[PDB]
Design a protein around this ligand. Structure first.
Ligand SMILES: *[C@@H]1O[C@H](CO)[C@@H](O[C@@H]2O[C@H](CO)[C@@H](O)[C@H](O)[C@H]2NC(C)=O)[C@H](O)[C@H]1NC(C)=O
Ligand SMILES: *[C@@H]1O[C@H](CO)[C@@H](O[C@@H]2O[C@H](CO)[C@@H](O)[C@H](O)[C@H]2NC(C)=O)[C@H](O)[C@H]1NC(C)=O
Ligand SMILES: *[C@@H]1O[C@H](CO)[C@@H](O[C@@H]2O[C@H](CO)[C@@H](O)[C@H](O)[C@H]2NC(C)=O)[C@H](O)[C@H]1NC(C)=O
Ligand SMILES: *[C@@H]1O[C@H](CO)[C@@H](O[C@@H]2O[C@H](CO)[C@@H](O)[C@H](O)[C@H]2NC(C)=O)[C@H](O)[C@H]1NC(C)=O
Ligand SMILES: *[C@@H]1O[C@H](CO)[C@@H](O[C@@H]2O[C@H](CO)[C@@H](O)[C@H](O)[C@H]2NC(C)=O)[C@H](O)[C@H]1NC(C)=O
Ligand SMILES: *[C@@H]1O[C@H](CO)[C@@H](O[C@@H]2O[C@H](CO)[C@@H](O)[C@H](O)[C@H]2NC(C)=O)[C@H](O)[C@H]1NC(C)=O
Lengths: 72, 711, 126, 67
């Protein structure tokens, strides 16, 4: 959306591979400059936490994302 | 049948037409020779009577469908009379169209541009703006003239041009044509001839094909001019970018002729100027005209009519007599061939005499054709004839045998490179301009270019085909194309392109008959009957035969080839390549004279609003420009204590996209040249960023002012 | 005699009081010529939107068409919108009030104000 | 306003309107435009003029240019 300057909302998770492919087709020159990420929650799920991270890194981050974060 | 009744009709029409036409032509000639109120009505009445006559006979022509008319001669004349044209348009529609045309013409002619400093001094295009665009070497002054012209007159033409397009298409569609573009491509269209047939669409293909073959030469010319213009305008031109449109030596960049002072290959070397020899040998207008006559007779062309010598403004009225003075050949009719021009003792006038007399020769040659078939094969044939005449006459060889250039002199190849560039500035320089303009009009008329993309594609095509960039971004409120005469005055333009090609094809063919051994750029067809014969073969044809056939008459081909044009500039080409060895031959269609201080701005309504996210329209943009102007004012009045009246018009936006991204730069309140430096603009934004975000219910994140960041 | 209060444009003039210390209080921006420039620009924006939407007419309303008058230290003043290039053509108060209400929120956003602080006398917030 | 190409000077055109034209709109147009053009240009000039005139008068032993 910042590279091929498409409308906000025009591209969704449902239509992403198609959009990026059509963009590569239109402008491969700049699409080459279009750095991307390789991410799947599966991997995210199987990302082990060393040490005491489960208490002071995972649970603490998740409590901040909750409302009334100080009561949790 | 039928054919017989069509013929008798045409015959009676032709006779009556000629005599009644003589009057019209003569009447106008008399007014062109003497400007009296009496002489106005004289031609006015004649004109009406003449036009009326034709109109009636046009209706009576329909009575003979060509489907049954086999003789081409009758067929041609009949179809040249069966044309209904704007008569097909409804009275109201026709009147509306006529009014638009008059308005557009009036705006172009009477539109003035006042100086920002003194509003009392308002320059019109004809003298003030043209002299600045042709002489003024001030980036600021030129930018003012160019921008001011499009901003004042170009907007006034935008709505008119839109209606014009609609009405024009309707008329042509009703005249059995795809669009007004197709209507205009009908000139070169040939049917019912064995191998000489030519489609209206074919023209497009041919023009584009030929254009691709010239591109290389033009790219070298462009690169050379760019390099020189970089010296004339330092810190203004990118050595890899396009050329600012306000620096091309004229208002539109149609010709690059006025860039010669800045691009002369060998400043130390002058060019042949036998005007002094003319005055020294007392060369009066009559003398120079006889030299023209001599030249034509030398190539075996019929002697100038005694009548010509008798009745012809070959010199300035001289007395109080008020007579217009534009070099013009007149076929008054009934064997009447006159030339009207305020001739002077000048090399230019000498060559102009040859050019004008060239047209007379063509007229005389086709004068024996059917009244309606007395014209150049196409719209680019007649002018090309005149051009090749001036070409042969200009050659130092010619002048040295005309007794003006002491033959003891030796033509310097440096002076030849000098001459060749000067010609390239006029000839090659107009080719992309002409091509791109007609392409744009064709696409517009056929609807390819929508109204919302008229200016968008105009500047895209300019940057890509011509390699010319706009110094200021122009939105769909502008009509830059309409700012040119031909566009605002409903005239075709492809004539110029085609003529140029034809001219070179003709010159080459004729010189081959003249048995030229040297560079074609220095060829004199004088004293060659063979060249004259080929020329005459086409000359006498007129419209009787297809233009494809007339081409075969001289060049031997049926289509326009650019090879001879390239051959003519081949010496220059080789030279340019050497000069452009170190230089980058080509341009990038991304560099703009305003990109440097342009701030990119991305807007994320849905990111900050989601639901109830208003649609960004022109009104939201208007608001944005207003907000920026507010910021600029505050910044200046606070940091600089300067009360600068910045308006939404000073905020110049470009590259607007559906991601709600765009580029903007700020200029001085009444100074297009004075661009507020990005640094100041960034500071102004920083100062009021909150306020701007508030106005659009956005935040630094959503209102991404690329280059400005919170801290 | 005559009334020194009678004006040919007073009929379509909308009085508008701007309150800052009441709303913004501390860190309240000072209303200057640039603030007034923003206001006329904001009104022109509203007029354009109103015409392009209600009457489906994209009219190029400009801050100059916003003829503000009787400016006071209360930040009170009157204003009557006119045609983009016709001083004779003055937009009726009724149509202007419709435009005002349509963009009242957005106008408040422009000045970080509210209907209570930004009082468009006659234009009643609901 | 309708046609920018047609421009009236005060003496020949604006005067024949303010003196003859009885059209409320036409009369307003001419009146407003006169003060919206020449008057604006004269504004800064008149300001400096007043200053220099006052200087001359005071220098000629006078209360003000009006004095
Ligand atoms: C088509 O019409 C032209 C017009 O008359 C004919 O041309 C004539 O040809 C005859 C025969 O050579 C000459 O005697 C005439 O003087 C010509 N007249 C003109 C004005 O050209 C032509 O021959 C006709 N074509 C056909 C198919 O018969
Ligand atoms: C110009 O007008 C004529 C007259 O209407 C058109 O010719 C007519 O075409 C229709 C359709 O085939 C016929 O029914 C009529 O009998 C024709 N009339 C005659 C006598 O020609 C012609 O097509 C029009 N052409 C242009 C240039 O628009
Ligand atoms: C064609 O031939 C004529 C005749 O020689 C040339 O005219 C002569 O030009 C020379 C050079 O100036 C003069 O010395 C002669 O007196 C001229 N003679 C006549 C009859 O005018 C003419 O220039 C030739 N044309 C070319 C350039 O090919
Ligand atoms: C015209 O011809 C002369 C003759 O060759 C050219 O002079 C040469 O110029 C090049 C480049 O400056 C030198 O490298 C050569 O040594 C020169 N040779 C001689 C014998 O002078 C001259 O450059 C040519 N003119 C043009 C415009 O190319
Ligand atoms: C309009 O803006 C342009 C660009 O800033 C000005 O041109 C430059 O002005 C500065 C300041 O006087 C000069 O030092 C430069 O030399 C000018 N540039 C050139 C190419 O000469 C221009 O003077 C401004 N004019 C107005 C009407 O304010
Ligand atoms: C400019 O605005 C004025 C005022 O609305 C217009 O004058 C009106 O014109 C119509 C049509 O002739 C009349 O019915 C009204 O009575 C006029 N009003 C007044 C106050 O006289 C004027 O026509 C407008 N001018 C343009 C060019 O649109």
């Amino acid at each position: 959306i910042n590279g091929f300057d498409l409308p906000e909302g025009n591209v969704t998770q449902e239509n992403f591979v198609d959009m990026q492919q059509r963009c590569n087709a239109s402008d491969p020159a700049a699409y080459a400059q279009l750095v991307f990420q390789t991410c799947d929650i599966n991997a995210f799920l199987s990302e082990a936490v060393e040490g005491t991270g489960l208490a002071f890194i995972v649970f603490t981050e998740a409590i901040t994302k909750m409302p009334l974060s100080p009561l949790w | 049948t039928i054919e017989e009744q069509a013929k008798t009709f045409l015959d009676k029409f032709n006779h009556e037409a000629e005599d009644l036409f003589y009057q019209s032509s003569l009447a106008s000639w008399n007014y062109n020779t003497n400007i009296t109120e009496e002489n106005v009505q004289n031609m006015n009445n004649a004109g009406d009577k003449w036009s009326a006559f034709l109109k009636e006979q046009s209706t009576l022509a329909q009575m003979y469908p060509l489907q049954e008319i086999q003789n081409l001669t009758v067929k041609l004349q009949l179809q040249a009379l069966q044309q209904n044209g704007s008569s097909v348009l409804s009275e109201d529609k026709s009147k509306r169209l006529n009014t638009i045309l008059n308005t557009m013409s009036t705006i172009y002619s009477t539109g003035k541009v006042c100086n920002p400093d003194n509003p009392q001094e308002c320059l019109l295009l004809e003298p003030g703006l043209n002299e600045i665009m042709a002489n003024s070497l001030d980036y600021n002054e030129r930018l003012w003239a160019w921008e001011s012209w499009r901003s004042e007159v170009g907007k006034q033409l935008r709505p008119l041009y839109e209606e014009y397009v609609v009405l024009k298409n309707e008329m042509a569609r009703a005249n059995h044509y795809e669009d007004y573009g197709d209507y205009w491509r009908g000139d070169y269209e040939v049917n019912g001839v064995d191998g000489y047939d030519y489609s209206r669409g074919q023209l497009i293909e041919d023009v584009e094909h030929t254009f691709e073959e010239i591109k290389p030469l033009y790219e070298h010319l462009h690169a050379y001019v760019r390099a020189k213009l970089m010296n004339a305008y330092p810190s203004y031109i990118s050595p890899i970018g396009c050329l600012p449109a306000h620096l091309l030596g004229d208002m539109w960049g149609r010709f690059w002729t006025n860039l010669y002072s800045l691009t002369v290959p060998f400043g130390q070397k002058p060019n042949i100027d036998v005007t002094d020899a003319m005055v020294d040998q007392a060369w009066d207008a009559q003398r120079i005209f006889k030299e023209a006559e001599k030249f034509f007779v030398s190539v075996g062309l019929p002697n100038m009519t005694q009548g010509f010598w008798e009745n012809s403004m070959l010199t300035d009225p001289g007395n109080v007599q008020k007579a217009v003075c534009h070099p013009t050949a007149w076929d008054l009719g009934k064997g009447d061939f006159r030339i009207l021009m305020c001739t002077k003792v000048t090399m230019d006038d000498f060559l102009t005499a040859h050019h004008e007399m060239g047209h007379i020769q063509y007229d005389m040659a086709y004068a024996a054709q059917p009244f309606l078939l007395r014209n150049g094969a196409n719209e680019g044939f007649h002018e090309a004839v005149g051009e090749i005449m001036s070409l042969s006459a200009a050659t130092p060889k010619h002048l040295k045998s005309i007794g003006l250039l002491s033959p003891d002199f030796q033509e310097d190849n440096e002076t030849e490179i000098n001459f060749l560039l000067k010609q390239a500035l006029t000839i090659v320089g107009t080719l992309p301009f002409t091509y791109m303009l007609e392409k744009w009009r064709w696409m517009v008329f056929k609807g390819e270019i929508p109204k919302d993309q008229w200016m968008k594609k105009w500047w895209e095509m300019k940057r890509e085909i011509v390699g010319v960039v706009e110094p200021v971004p122009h939105d769909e409120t502008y009509c830059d194309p309409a700012s040119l005469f031909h566009v605002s005055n409903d005239y075709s333009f492809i004539r110029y392109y085609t003529r140029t090609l034809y001219q070179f094809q003709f010159q080459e063919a004729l010189c081959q008959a003249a048995k030229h051994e040297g560079p074609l750029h220095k060829c004199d067809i004088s004293n060659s009957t063979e060249a004259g014969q080929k020329l005459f073969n086409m000359l006498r044809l007129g419209k009787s035969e297809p233009w494809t056939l007339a081409l075969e008459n001289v060049v031997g081909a049926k289509n326009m080839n650019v090879r001879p044009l390239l051959n003519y500039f081949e010496p220059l080409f080789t030279w340019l390549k050497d000069q452009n060895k170190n230089s980058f031959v080509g341009w990038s269609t991304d560099w703009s004279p305003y990109a440097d201080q342009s701030i990119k701005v991305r807007i994320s309504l849905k990111s900050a609003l989601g639901d109830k996210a208003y649609e960004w329209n022109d009104n939201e943009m208007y608001l944005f420009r207003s907000s920026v102007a507010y910021a600029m004012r505050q910044y200046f009045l606070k940091v600089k204590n300067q009360m600068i009246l910045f308006g939404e018009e000073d905020v110049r936006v470009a590259n607007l996209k559906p991601r709600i991204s765009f580029n903007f730069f700020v200029t001085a309140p009444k100074n297009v040249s004075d661009i507020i430096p990005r640094t100041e603009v960034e500071k102004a934004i920083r100062m009021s960023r909150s306020r701007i975000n508030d106005a659009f219910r956005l935040n630094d994140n959503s209102l991404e002012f690329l280059g400005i960041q919170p801290t």
